[PDB]
Amino acid sequence: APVRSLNCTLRDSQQKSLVMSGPYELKALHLQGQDMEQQVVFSMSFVQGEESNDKIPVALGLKEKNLYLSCVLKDDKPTLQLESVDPKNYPKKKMEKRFVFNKIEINNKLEFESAQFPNWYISTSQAENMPVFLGGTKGGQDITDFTMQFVS
Ligand SMILES: C1C[C@@H](CNC2CC2)CO1
């Protein structure tokens, strides 16, 4: 059958929102009130992959954009990028591995581990207005925990 998707927003555990800041660039900042319309709405697809009670493979597309978060080696390091795709072919149930995150539920929070790069996580900085990035470190001024919000 089709692939199933939900619209949602994400906030880091310090409650910073994610907003598109220039061509292909997600940034995390503290947001409230009018400015909350700036936040990125994801289409979270439930994709093929290794699964357990608390570990669910997803893809993170930007709502009604042919753009996905992906994990690739850049200058020899696992990095997070926004990657464009053929809008005729996405989303799909069998997403390529660079697009797949293991959504892990621990203590009422979510972590997004790269399926491609074990123990590398979607991360934010403690500082305001810095890039969302892939981090291979868990607890060291890098926020790897998020809360999920379901939107209409
Ligand atoms: C989405 C992917 C990431 C790209 N980082 C590179 C510095 C641009 C930031 O937002």
From Swiss-Prot:
Activation of the IL1B precursor involves a CASP1-catalyzed proteolytic cleavage. Processing and secretion are temporarily associated. (Microbial infection) Cleavage by S.pyogenes cysteine protease SpeB promotes its activation independently of CASP1. SpeB-mediated maturation of IL1B plays a dual role depending on infection site: while IL1B inflammatory response prevents bacterial growth during invasive skin infections, it promotes streptococcal infection of the nasopharynx by disrupting colonization resistance mediated by the microbiota. GO terms for biological process: apoptotic process; astrocyte activation; cell-cell signaling; cellular response to interleukin-17; cellular response to lipopolysaccharide; cellular response to mechanical stimulus; cellular response to xenobiotic stimulus; cytokine-mediated signaling pathway. The record marks 4 as: Involved in receptor binding. One of its GO terms (molecular function) is cytokine activity. A motif (Involved in interaction with TMED10 C-terminus) lies at residues 112-125. It comes from the Eukaryota. Induction: By LPS. Transcription and translation induced by M.tuberculosis and a number of different M.tuberculosis components in macrophages; EsxA is the most potent activator tested (at protein level). In pancreatic islets, release is increased by high glucose treatment. In pancreatic islets and macrophages, release is also increased by endocannabinoid anandamide/AEA. Potent pro-inflammatory cytokine. Initially discovered as the major endogenous pyrogen, induces prostaglandin synthesis, neutrophil influx and activation, T-cell activation and cytokine production, B-cell activation and antibody production, and fibroblast proliferation and collagen production. Promotes Th17 differentiation of T-cells. Synergizes with IL12/interleukin-12 to induce IFNG synthesis from T-helper 1 (Th1) cells. Plays a role in angiogenesis by inducing VEGF production synergistically with TNF and IL6. Belongs to the IL-1 family. This is Interleukin-1 beta. It comes from Homo sapiens (Human). The chain holds residues 117 to 268 of 269 of the full protein.
